[PDB]
Amino acid sequence: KVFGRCELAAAMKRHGLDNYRGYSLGNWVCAAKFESNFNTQATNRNTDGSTDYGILQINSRWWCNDGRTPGSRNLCNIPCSALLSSDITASVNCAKKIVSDGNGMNAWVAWRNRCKGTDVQAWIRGCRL
């Protein structure tokens, strides 16, 4: 499913993501924008073998099991395909574990290169929330 900007903002807030570990909504919506372009099915294969999956391009080396990343840790205890669903629940619950890991939203390289320190408030601007 390709979400619309305020449609995803409302789903992320609904899932506890507005201000989860201090990251206003705006940060999370800017992160999904540049990671996947709001598309729950987007997948990307990194140069280390692993593959990135879903709305928040969650990586198969640490966080989910995709059966083709040797040495992977599956810390969110989930098959990576649960992350592609049109229901963002699994993606949001995994992202909550990743932001808590010590480095916040810096885990997401497009958040720190493109979002971080921008008027992430603009990503939720005309929305009924």
Swiss-Prot record:
EC number assigned by the record: 3.2.1.17
Q: What is any one GO biological process for this UniProt entry? A: defense response to Gram-negative bacterium
Sites binding substrate sit at D101
Task: Output the Gene Ontology terms for molecular function.
Answer: beta-N-acetylglucosaminidase activity; identical protein binding; lysozyme activity
Enumerate the catalysed reactions.
Answer: Hydrolysis of (1->4)-beta-linkages between N-acetylmuramic acid and N-acetyl-D-glucosamine residues in a peptidoglycan and between N-acetyl-D-glucosamine residues in chitodextrins
Tissue expression, as annotated, is: In the egg white and polymorphonuclear leukocytes.
Active site per database record: E35, D52
Q: What class of enzyme is it?
A: hydrolase
What Gene3D superfamilies does UniProt report for this protein, alphabetically?
Answer: 1.10.530.10
Subcellular compartments: Secreted
The record's subunit annotation is: Monomer.
Relate the protein's function as given in its record.
Lysozymes have primarily a bacteriolytic function; those in tissues and body fluids are associated with the monocyte-macrophage system and enhance the activity of immunoagents. Has bacteriolytic activity against M.luteus.
Protein name (Swiss-Prot/TrEMBL): Lysozyme C
**What is the native source organism of this protein?**
Gallus gallus (Chicken)
Query: Which gene name belongs to this protein?
Result: LYZ
